RNA sequence: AAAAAA
RNA sequence: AAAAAA
RNA sequence: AAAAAA
């Protein structure tokens, strides 16, 4: 066979070729650190490479309390140490500085040069609040956070500091988030994991994750709900994406998810978290399904017509978009003659589906608008 | 299979990712410390953390006497203890204030920097009064809350201290009922569990727990109402929901359903716990079947028209509602041909259907004037 | 999250 | 060796 | 990477 080359470098045996050791510091006064951490996030210390044991202790007294046997003995835990990292011990009780902790100058010197109004669970649900949208840029997860700190402020359930609503805080919770594996994956773990119990801030977490899957990751959900149609037979191939000068692309496209699939539960992150294979979904490698299958949802999503694409896409997008919006309006028309709705039924049902129709269009073009507008104000 | 990948992060096993340890303090003068931590609810205080150990205490004192042994071995820590929470009994006897239970700094001066006239029982069934609509923000649980209130007095069964029914006093309530996961659980334990002997006060909470059925999942009772109608021979999908557009979110609402489904009995205030899988429930995630959903229900619930979607969905819902009204009335005509009443008998109830649809019509109409007023006054 | 429920 | 690929 | 989601 001389095509399995081209999958040659796409799958490789799940092994170890890195290795991450985390000291964990085991204190009395957890708490008293707890807060010491949250205080320098919010004067801007950058932690470099001691930062996975910072917000490690915080994670840690937020799930559970300061038990850290039952900390490494968790699942987040064990699906890391098979990937390389190392959890260690280190009982460096009796601290009053962050300093003191440290193993990196220029955070000691940071810290050396230094009361809050936040525990650890509220840093920590903060911090969830950049994860829809936190691989979208900075500036449109800034929004998203801004935008979740209103509702929940509305829903009564959690309130943060002033101080944290400030840009300036926002863009270092943000650098974290984007830089940090260990605190995206805990919290995505926590969010994906608990059952009941939760608490304000661990509604807040949950929501955040839930929010999350698939951030990213739209060529996963315009291909696999629009273009590839599961029905009780198998998979159908959507009537735009069959030309054979796409067909490649959708069996590339197949192809990638097969790799993000190893990845189990956490595949609807893997853009969040870097997990192997995400580089087999980029839009350049499949120009036509990406353009189709985006085109094609957007008949469907009204809303989904605010997504931008790059200028190689657009032209090919609204041409699925209007096949497929005629496509439908085709098959809703025929359906409604093989339904046992005599005539007077039918006539009302052919009515509700051109006020459907025609307040979907309506709603499309108003996103249109707004994302034109959108490009207007960034340029 | 690829469709896989679209359901990885919605079903987990179930493990414990957290632990809460909640002291139970046992002590010989528990009527003492529930009339302090009464007195210091009424004051406005906030415990924080230890919240968990006083709404426990006010819990175990009413339901069984201050018998902890019973209390431990009870349906509601069997369930708790299974997702993280650790009860320990902590012998503090003597105490005369409750800054001698706490274990926070800003709760001990609160507290140290202060005879009520109720009970466990009435601080615990007035809480109550807050589930229905907890999750429908503070304005809307505070009138459902006065509702009640005048209700329980022309009842003769219940009358609360004018203080509690003062709005700075329910606030304190409601935040506590928005924050506090254990006090919710356990008022929803017993509620559903008693069978009879109920007092009062526990008329109070089965009552309110009841009124709690499904607040906050109101999907799930339009859509498995009127769009999913289980029938002899399985389940009929209605026709305003046979699109294609739709069917969709007609499957992926059925795979949210079939998460909520882990929780049993509790799966009904799954919006009000948090429960996992909640989240696969929002009306953003089905905007079609949304607006349809309850589109079609408001044809029939006269009241059911008082309740507000956003923009996107309100001209969907309008005109799924005239179509099911114009669909009833066909099937309500031709429903008579079908049964044995011969020609006067089918009159009479053909009139009967008349005056029976204009009397829906214009209470329909009354309740959105009344929710075209009530936004008015919000605006 | 948004309506009704002695 | 020659192009595209958040 | 680009949209919506109490």
Same mark, same amino acid.
């Given at each position: 066979?001389?095509?399995?080359?081209?999958?040659? @470098?796409?799958?490789?045996?799940?092994?170890?070729?890195?290795?991450?050791?985390?000291? *964990?510091?085991? %204190?009395?006064?957890?708490?008293?650190?707890?807060?010491?951490?949250?205080?320098?996030?919010?004067?801007?210390?950058?932690?470099?490479?001691?930062?996975?044991?910072?917000?490690?202790?915080?994670?840690?007294?937020?799930?559970?309390?300061?038990?850290?046997?039952?900390?490494?003995?968790? @699942?987040?835990?064990?699906?890391?140490?098979?990937?390389?990292?190392?959890?260690? *011990?280190?009982?460096?009780?009796?601290?009053?500085? $962050?300093?003191?902790? $440290?193993?990196?100058?220029?955070?000691?010197?940071?810290?050396?040069?230094?009361?809050?109004?936040?525990?650890?669970?509220?840093?920590?649900?903060?911090?969830?609040?950049?994860?829809?949208?936190?691989? %979208?840029?900075?500036?449109?997860?800034?929004?998203?956070?801004?935008?979740?700190?209103?509702?929940?402020?509305?829903?009564?359930?959690?309130?943060?500091?002033?101080?944290? =609503?400030? %840009?300036?805080?926002?863009?270092?919770?943000?650098?974290?988030?984007?830089?940090?594996?260990?605190?995206?994956?805990?919290?995505?773990?926590?969010?994906?994991?608990?059952?009941?119990?939760?608490?304000?801030?661990?509604?807040?977490? +949950?929501?955040?994750?839930?929010?999350? !899957?698939?951030?990213?990751?739209?060529?996963?959900?315009? %291909?696999?709900?629009?273009? $590839?149609?599961?029905?009780? !037979?198998?998979?159908?191939?959507?009537?735009?994406?069959?030309?054979?000068?796409?067909?490649?692309?959708?069996?590339?496209?197949?192809?990638?998810? +097969?790799?993000?699939?190893?990845?189990?539960?956490?595949?609807?992150?893997?853009?969040?978290?870097?997990?192997?294979?995400?580089?087999?979904?980029?839009?350049?490698?499949?120009?036509?399904?990406?353009?189709?299958?985006?085109? *094609?949802?957007?008949?469907?999503?009204?809303?989904?017509? @605010?997504?931008?694409?790059?200028?190689?896409?657009?032209?090919? !997008?609204?041409?699925?978009?209007?096949?497929?919006?005629?496509?439908?309006?085709?098959?809703?028309?025929?359906?409604?003659?093989?339904?046992?709705?005599?005539? =007077?039924?039918?006539?009302?049902?052919?009515?509700?589906?051109?006020?459907?129709?025609?307040?979907?269009?309506?709603?499309?073009?108003?996103?249109?608008?707004?994302?034109?507008?959108?490009?207007?104000?960034?340029?």
């Amino acid at each position: 066979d001389y095509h399995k080359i081209l999958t040659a @470098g796409l799958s490789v045996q799940q092994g170890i070729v890195r290795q991450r050791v985390i000291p *964990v510091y085991q %204190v009395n006064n957890l708490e008293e650190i707890c807060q010491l951490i949250i205080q320098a996030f919010e004067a801007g210390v950058d932690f470099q490479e001691s930062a996975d044991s910072f917000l490690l202790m915080l994670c840690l007294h937020h799930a559970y309390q300061g038990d850290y046997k039952l900390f490494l003995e968790s @699942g987040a835990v064990k699906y890391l140490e098979g990937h390389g990292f190392r959890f260690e *011990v280190k009982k460096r009780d009796g601290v009053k500085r $962050l300093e003191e902790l $440290l193993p990196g100058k220029n955070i000691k010197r940071t810290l050396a040069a230094m009361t809050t109004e936040a525990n650890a669970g509220q840093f920590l649900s903060f911090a969830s609040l950049f994860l829809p949208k936190l691989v %979208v840029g900075e500036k449109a997860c800034l929004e998203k956070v801004q935008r979740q700190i209103q509702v929940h402020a509305e829903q009564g359930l959690i309130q943060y500091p002033t101080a944290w =609503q400030s %840009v300036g805080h926002m863009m270092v919770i943000f650098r974290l988030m984007r830089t940090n594996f260990l605190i995206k994956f805990l919290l995505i773990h926590q969010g994906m994991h608990m059952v009941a119990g939760h608490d304000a801030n661990d509604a807040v977490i +949950s929501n955040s994750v839930a929010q999350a !899957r698939f951030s990213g990751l739209l060529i996963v959900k315009t %291909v696999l709900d629009h273009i $590839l149609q599961k029905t009780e !037979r198998g998979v159908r191939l959507h009537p735009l994406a069959r030309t054979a000068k796409v067909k490649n692309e959708v069996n590339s496209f197949k192809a990638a998810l +097969s790799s993000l699939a190893k990845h189990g539960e956490y595949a609807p992150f893997a853009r969040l978290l870097n997990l192997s294979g995400v580089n087999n979904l980029e839009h350049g490698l499949f120009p036509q399904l990406s353009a189709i299958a985006l085109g *094609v949802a957007t008949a469907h999503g009204s809303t989904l017509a @605010g997504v931008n694409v790059g200028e190689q896409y657009q032209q090919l !997008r609204e041409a699925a978009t209007e096949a497929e919006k005629q496509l439908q309006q085709y098959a809703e028309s025929r359906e409604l003659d093989h339904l046992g709705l005599d005539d =007077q039924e039918k006539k009302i049902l052919m009515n509700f589906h051109q006020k459907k129709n025609e307040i979907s269009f309506q709603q499309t073009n108003a996103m249109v608008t707004l994302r034109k507008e959108r490009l207007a104000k960034l340029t």
